[PDB]
RNA sequence: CUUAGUAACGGCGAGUGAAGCGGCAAAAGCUCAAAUUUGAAAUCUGGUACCUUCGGUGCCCGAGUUGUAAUUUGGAGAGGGCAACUUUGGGGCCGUUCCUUGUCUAUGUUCCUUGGAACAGGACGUCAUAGAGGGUGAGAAUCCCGUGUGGCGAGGAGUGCGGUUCUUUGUAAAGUGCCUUCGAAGAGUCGAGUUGUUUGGGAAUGCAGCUCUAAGUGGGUGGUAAAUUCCAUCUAAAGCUAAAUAUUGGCGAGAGACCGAUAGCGAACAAGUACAGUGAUGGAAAGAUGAAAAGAACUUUGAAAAGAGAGUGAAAAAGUACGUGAAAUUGUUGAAAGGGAAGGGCAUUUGAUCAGACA
RNA sequence: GGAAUACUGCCAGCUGGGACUGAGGACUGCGACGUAAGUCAAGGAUGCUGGCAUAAUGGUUAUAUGCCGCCCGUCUUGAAACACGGACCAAGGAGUCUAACGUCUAUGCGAGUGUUUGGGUGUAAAACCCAUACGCGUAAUGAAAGUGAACGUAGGUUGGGGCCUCGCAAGAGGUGCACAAUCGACCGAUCCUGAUGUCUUCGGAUGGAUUUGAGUAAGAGCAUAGCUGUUGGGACCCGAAAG
RNA sequence: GUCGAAUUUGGGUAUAGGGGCGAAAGACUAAUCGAACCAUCUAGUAGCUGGUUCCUGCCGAAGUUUCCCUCAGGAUAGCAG
RNA sequence: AAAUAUGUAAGAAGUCCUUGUUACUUAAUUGAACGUGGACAUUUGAAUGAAGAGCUUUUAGUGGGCCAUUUUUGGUAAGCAGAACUGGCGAUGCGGGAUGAACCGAACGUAGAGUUAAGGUGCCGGAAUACACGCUCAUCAGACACCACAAAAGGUGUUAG
RNA sequence: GCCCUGAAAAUGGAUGGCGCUCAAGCGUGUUACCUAUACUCUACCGUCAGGGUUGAUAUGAUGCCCUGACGAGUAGGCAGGCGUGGAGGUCAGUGACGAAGCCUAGACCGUAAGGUCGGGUCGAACGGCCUCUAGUGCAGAUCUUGGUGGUAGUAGCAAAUAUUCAAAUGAGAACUUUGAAGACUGAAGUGGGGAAAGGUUCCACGUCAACAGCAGUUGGACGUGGGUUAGUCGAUCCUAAGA
RNA sequence: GUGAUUUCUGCCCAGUGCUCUGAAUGUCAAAGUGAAGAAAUUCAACCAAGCGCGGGUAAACGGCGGAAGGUAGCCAAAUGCCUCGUCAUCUAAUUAGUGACGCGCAUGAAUGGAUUAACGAGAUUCCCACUGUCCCUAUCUACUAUCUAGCGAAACCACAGCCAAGGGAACGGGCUUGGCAGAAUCAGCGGGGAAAGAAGACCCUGUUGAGCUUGACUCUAGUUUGACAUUGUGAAG
RNA sequence: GAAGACAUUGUCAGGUGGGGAGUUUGGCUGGGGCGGCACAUCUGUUAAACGAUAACGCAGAUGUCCUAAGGGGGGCUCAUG
RNA sequence: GUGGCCUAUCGAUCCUUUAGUCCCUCGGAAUUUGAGGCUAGAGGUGCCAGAAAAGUUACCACAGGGAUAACUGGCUUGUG
RNA sequence: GCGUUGGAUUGUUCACCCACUAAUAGGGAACGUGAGCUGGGUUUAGACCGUCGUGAGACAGGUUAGUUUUACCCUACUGAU
């Protein structure tokens, strides 16, 4: 069953794989149960925003590093310079995560500002039953966007100190590859 | 469509384009990859040379993120800064002024140098680069910003 | 969704084949063991009386110290000392939400022709947030039910919350600052050898048998075995938990460029039926008179079945062997040919039969 | 010695009889005969006349006569075969769909391309709108660590359509995209050479080599659709002895 | 042929499919035995036999090369569109 | 030492004159290779022909063959087995050989007229019971390639030498 | 050279047959004549190639027209078309004053796949064109299901010794009933009871379409009813191999 | 295993099996032990059963020539190729039968040899009786066939049904050339229809099976041997 | 009563194991089998004066041998009569 | 002069092993063993483009084959 | 043209004898003739012996036991309308 130039194929069919197709007819179907299901839950639950705060976090990987992204939740270190409890916080519609730790003080200071704006723009009826009414936003996600840090501003001067920046990169990895090796010697000597 | 293919050609034909020496029979010479070194040697020793052993070493669980480093040349370098704002930078090349570019920002992770750039000076900020990116670079009055 | 038919596995042949990151849907957190309540087993089943009965109170036995409550689960937390404020609990009633149902809410059957029947054609109108669908003697928005838009009811569920109302729970309970001493954390288990099985997991991925069997600045992991030196990261051997996911079964609905009685489920019908097999099992065929039986009174021939008339019907060229009624095959009538086949091709005679222009 | 005739050949010599054909549809051409006007057998038929106007011609059909004609389908070098299936009729009855792909073609956009996982919205499985990512492409080469594409108008030579200049033309000169052959240069691998400097073992400049790559050298791709072809699937339809 | 016995026979009961039972024939085990019957895996695989459904127009072959546990089959080159 | 087959050449990518490059080569500007510039146009280097030449991608069927003339091997031989070149059959009807896959002629759109091929012209049967010179008598005459058979040896049958 | 001897095979027999003898035989020469789907000329169809023509006011530049050549074909390739179920659009299409279907050696168009019309039968839906889609075209597969032939009024309806006369009944009697006669089973029976198995076949009345391979007034058939009585006969109780 | 009784059961233990209170320093698993190494690990010693070595065994499998060389018997026998062996007997004539002979292709001793009264729907030869088995056919009876009334199938069927030769897939109902050829039919008949009944059981092919066998390849239930665990207590050599 | 840390049982290890299981048991070939190798190769011929060319055609050969029997140089000339 | 005067005298993938380079990797970071790669050979497939493989069926089976044997017939006639 | 026989042994074709006779010639017709017979032989399955094979089994060696189906059609032929 091999002729003529043609790429050779891997198509993994030899098992009884017509006894578990999927085909996604449902597909408008689970949209319109998924939009009733968000109107049902916003009208049932309060004219709370439907979703929590999330605090904004670096993703880790030498690939996505560069990229901020929204994390789990506040970490206890973060809440508390913020001025409230978690056990509050929670109760608020904060999200608190307590296995994440802060190492870096830009995500933490972020953080702690993320904080700062909601509690100026929320407002926590009292427990006695009033309860005015007011406007439902849907959305605390698209009240407080995520931006990218700024890094450079757009120009500046040229500073040249004349060493090769490839010269560098053969320094540092030179050295690394020979640091075990030059101990060594040092050490037996 | 159906109404455009052969076999409403073939109608009435008997042997419906298959011969009838030869005949249409169910799996002549095996099924898949069957006889890649008996009997259908000729047909892999062409058109697929190297089929046939193992050359290098092994790698137990390779992640491809470790290797992400999307390279840009240095004729594409100028389309990193946006249309609006290239040209006045072209005529007022100097000192003081110089556009700062983040390489990495835009998704690159080494520069390395096959065409030519203006003469106007230029900051590159980026992760990795050749040793003749960084030389044209300088040949027009910029310089290269190591970043991690 | 992607990573990815990739790393890797494989008589490295045929073939096989994950995972981290990234975007998205949905989002929710937690509690036991290990601590002396020790100035008071503070806990609980059952029985019995009463009551505002998915339960409550009094009383009496019992369980339980070989440990039942309160307090603390690693994010911590606990015993003392000091200084401060902040924050409520459990029910009725009426609304709202949800589900199961009921009822009300437009406009021609006006004229002519055909027909057994007007629901057809023609003419003139009306309603329309209603011209979806079905029925009624043939294609009906306007004849009937419904459809569209709204109104008024009835019976339940859940406390989800929107208001009112009865109880002060409580020298109760919770949260937060600083100082000091402490900070208990799961064993024939982890781990190791070996055997078998399994995995993409390769000096061995998970699981299981047997043998050996730990530690507490310890232990597991960091995808190549080992010794030595560091680092990173979690906290096993105890437990609970909605949503996004699955669904050829069950119940209730809405649909199709699907099939149209040898098709579509085996079954459109008294179908898992009739029937077969000791048994497990096997398993059919079969839908249509007409708008309405108006299903043929009566006369006559025949022992009778029936026939010939008559009659019903728009039609018996619809008679319960029933819509339409093809072919194979058959009867009667008419024409033609025929000395061991028949049929066919080209051409014309003879017979029968037929269209086209009379410009 | 002087003729004739036979045989063979030529005539842009003349003339009688018979058969088949009538394509085309204003004019245009080449000629002929004429002093001329015109005419003609000159780039394809007209003129005159008779009978009948219907089954007379003709069509269809049955039959008769002359000649010819073996049963189709199938395998096969070879079938009318003493090779196989077929008594007859009706209905049913066999290259399909899917995943991943090759070539070619059409379409959109283009160094980009792909709205439909999902979100918004809706006259509600339709249509319409949209962020972030991701896939492929835009860089190759090594087992790997790794390194990474201009000496030069992005090179030279030969052949090149088209365009430009001159020329009545023929031709000559200039410029030459795509494409073809060839010599070079550039990047990675391999084999050598080993400068300025040194954590004295690091660093690897410079210059080479009948070596090697699915490379560079002013990008072509991405998406949808169709015929044909490929592989896994029941896989064009029906069929085993078995397990 | 045999006919008073190793006789003939009714009913009850036991042995079940790689098993049973066999004065032994590979015999018998419900017309089924050199491995019963029933359903499923299963539309099991077949280089082998048979079949494969409308018309007209244009072009138009091969039984040869090399390799194959290859010799009734494939790959490859050729011939063809 | 043939015949038949078979390689190459018959120009512009050619010829000639002058002189540039090099790390090759030479005792040596000696040579080699590649070039600058100049001179010679299509009787520009024999014949004939040329439904134009060149090039690329993709894919079907096939991979049992057989026959005739000539060359040829095994075998007593075979309608046997196996090769060489060409033409055929297979895949192909039509006229002829009575009949036949392969022989002879000729290859095919639908018609009309004319002329022929191979083969024929007593009758079947379209066409001369034509013409001319001879031969042959058979109590098993003979009669047309492939082809459907006859020999050695004899006759004072008859004819010619 | 011709002829003859040499020269023997099995159904009857083949210069193709008849027949032919100065041939209608054999060798050779000269003419006439016959006829292929071949050759020559003309018409028409198609294919391929090279060309002409956008000018409005008249319709197809995939149009129209001019010129030349060509035409075999299995396996196989490609192209242009015909027909079928369903879908979007359109023809304000056809129809109870008759849609679809079916029958029709009646008519017309197309090389063909097919299309159109008239007549008869019939009773409720259906078609043209531009596009979309497929469970889309049958003569065969010892094909599937159903229906029907020739064979053919044919094979046959012959084991178990055997029937005959009269009356009654009835539309109808070789076969029912009664009487008479002749026979057989011959007590290990064709007699009289039961076990298993069957399940109303038992009995009476009514009745003959089907069944009793002839017949039928008869029946184990068809229709409607009636009928099985236990302290002592069995089950029940006991134990056997065994479960 | 052999197969009543009678009589007799010879020789061979090299091979293949089976078996042993035999032998010892051959071969040898896991565990355990020792050495080297920083360890993973490597090396060496020790070492169960079995195997090897040794002995026994044929009414174990089997053998009996030119480990032992066919003994007692028996035979052209159901065992002899040559072979219809040679001689005798039986017949007019015998590939038959019987009796002898034996360098026996290839007889033979519980893979039992030889002989045996009685018995046998066993296989053979001859004789007497008997007969239609035959010479050589004839005749009779019943029921069929046959004809009529009623009733009424099936196999099979491309189309069909007269020959001779020819050529042809090398044996025609059809094709070619000749012979011929006249409606519709009844009872018989087995020449032909290469008649019908079944996708040849023979043979070959297929990278298709199954039953059975074996020191084929690869395994396995069972069994046996060693180690560890179950697994404690006391003493001696 | 017997027996005793031995049997037994559990887990690994060696042997035995057609009692049983699964599977295999070439090709060419004047049918197949037996034989042969025409199955990977070499010389001459068949082979028809380029090359190519078949048969279980004809006559033979190969799975080795050599530190020289390899490389260079020098000197010499063999069989037979 | 890059073995034998010329024309024959021989072998892939996987695996093992040796030589060379002492170069690359063990992917949290190092040193040392071990393992894995790069280049060139050897261990062999003689069915020599290279599966690891004993019989029997007279109890037999299936798919096929007149591509192929056991009868006639046809060609041939050595032999008779 | 006309005849070419009767028997012993053998399944036999063939062969070999006895005897009669004018003579006991050779052949064909799908090696004529099985819906004409017969079934002794060969050539299914049972069984025995010899040789061969470890064995299952083999033997063109011997021996014994082993189901012979259908015509009513067409033609031919024989008779009959
Ligand atoms: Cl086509
Ligand atoms: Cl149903
Ligand atoms: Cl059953
Ligand atoms: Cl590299
Ligand atoms: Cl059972
Ligand atoms: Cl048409
Ligand atoms: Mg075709
Ligand atoms: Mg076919
Ligand atoms: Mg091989
Ligand atoms: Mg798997
Ligand atoms: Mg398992
Ligand atoms: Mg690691
Ligand atoms: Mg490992
Ligand atoms: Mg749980
Ligand atoms: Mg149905
Ligand atoms: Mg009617
Ligand atoms: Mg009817
Ligand atoms: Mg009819
Ligand atoms: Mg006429
Ligand atoms: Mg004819
Ligand atoms: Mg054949
Ligand atoms: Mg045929
Ligand atoms: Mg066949
Ligand atoms: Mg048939
Ligand atoms: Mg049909
Ligand atoms: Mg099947
Ligand atoms: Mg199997
Ligand atoms: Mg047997
Ligand atoms: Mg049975
Ligand atoms: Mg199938
Ligand atoms: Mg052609
Ligand atoms: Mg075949
Ligand atoms: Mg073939
Ligand atoms: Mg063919
Ligand atoms: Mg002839
Ligand atoms: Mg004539
Ligand atoms: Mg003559
Ligand atoms: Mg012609
Ligand atoms: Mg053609
Ligand atoms: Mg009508
Ligand atoms: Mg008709
Ligand atoms: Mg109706
Ligand atoms: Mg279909
Ligand atoms: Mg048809
Ligand atoms: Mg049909
Ligand atoms: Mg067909
Ligand atoms: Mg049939
Ligand atoms: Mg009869
Ligand atoms: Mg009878
Ligand atoms: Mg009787
Ligand atoms: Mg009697
Ligand atoms: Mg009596
Ligand atoms: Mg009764
Ligand atoms: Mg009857
Ligand atoms: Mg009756
Ligand atoms: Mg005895
Ligand atoms: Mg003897
Ligand atoms: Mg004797
Ligand atoms: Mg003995
Ligand atoms: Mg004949
Ligand atoms: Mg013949
Ligand atoms: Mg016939
Ligand atoms: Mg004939
Ligand atoms: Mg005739
Ligand atoms: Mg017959
Ligand atoms: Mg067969
Ligand atoms: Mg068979
Ligand atoms: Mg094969
Ligand atoms: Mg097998
Ligand atoms: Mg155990
Ligand atoms: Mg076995
Ligand atoms: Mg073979
Ligand atoms: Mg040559
Ligand atoms: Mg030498
Ligand atoms: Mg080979
Ligand atoms: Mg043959
Ligand atoms: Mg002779
Ligand atoms: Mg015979
Ligand atoms: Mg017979
Ligand atoms: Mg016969
Ligand atoms: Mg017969
Ligand atoms: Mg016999
Ligand atoms: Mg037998
Ligand atoms: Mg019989």
Redesign the interface.
């Given at each position: 069953?091999?002729?003529?130039?043609?790429p050779?194929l891997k198509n993994h069919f030899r098992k009884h794989w017509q006894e578990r197709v999927k085909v996604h007819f449902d597909q408008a179907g689970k949209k319109v149960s998924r939009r009733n299901a968000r109107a049902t839950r916003a009208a049932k639950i309060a004219p709370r925003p439907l979703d929590l705060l999330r605090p904004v976090v670096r993703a880790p990987?030498?690939?996505?590093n560069?990229k901020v992204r929204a994390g789990r939740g506040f970490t206890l270190a973060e809440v508390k310079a913020a001025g409230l409890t978690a056990a509050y916080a929670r109760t608020i519609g904060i999200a608190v995560d307590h296995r994440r730790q802060n190492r870096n003080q830009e995500i933490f200071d972020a953080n702690v500002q993320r904080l700062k704006e909601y509690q100026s723009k929320i407002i926590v009826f009292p427990r006695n039953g009033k309860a005015p009414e007011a406007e439902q936003v849907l959305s605390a996600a698209a009240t407080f966007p995520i931006a990218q840090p700024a890094?450079?501003?757009?120009?500046?001067?040229?500073?040249?100190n004349g060493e090769?920046?490839?010269r560098?990169?053969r320094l540092a990895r030179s050295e690394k590859k020979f640091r075990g090796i030059r101990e060594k010697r040092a050490r037996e000597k | 469509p159906s109404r455009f293919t052969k076999t409403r050609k073939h109608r009435g034909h008997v042997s419906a384009g298959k011969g009838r020496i030869g005949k249409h029979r169910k799996?002549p010479?095996?099924?898949?990859?069957?006889?890649?070194q008996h009997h259908?040697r000729i047909?892999?020793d062409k058109?697929?040379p190297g089929?046939f052993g193992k050359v290098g070493m092994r790698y137990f669980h390779k992640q491809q993120?470790?290797f992400?480093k999307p390279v840009l040349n240095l004729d594409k370098l100028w389309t990193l800064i946006p249309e609006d704002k290239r040209d006045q930078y072209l005529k007022s090349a100097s000192?003081?002024?110089?556009?700062?570019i983040?390489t990495?920002?835009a998704g690159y992770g080494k520069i390395l140098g096959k065409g030519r750039i203006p003469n106007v000076?230029v900051?590159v900020?980026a992760r990795?680069?050749?040793?003749l990116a960084?030389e044209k670079i300088?040949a027009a009055?910029?310089?290269?910003?190591?970043i991690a």
């Open positions: 069953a091999i002729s003529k130039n043609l050779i990987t030498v690939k996505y560069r890094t450079d501003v757009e120009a500046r001067a040229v500073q040249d090769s920046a490839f560098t990169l | 799996h010479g095996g099924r898949g990859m069957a006889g890649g259908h047909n892999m058109y697929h089929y993120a470790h992400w000192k003081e002024t110089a556009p700062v983040d990495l920002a000076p900051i900020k990795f680069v050749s040793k960084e300088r009055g910029g310089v290269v910003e190591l």
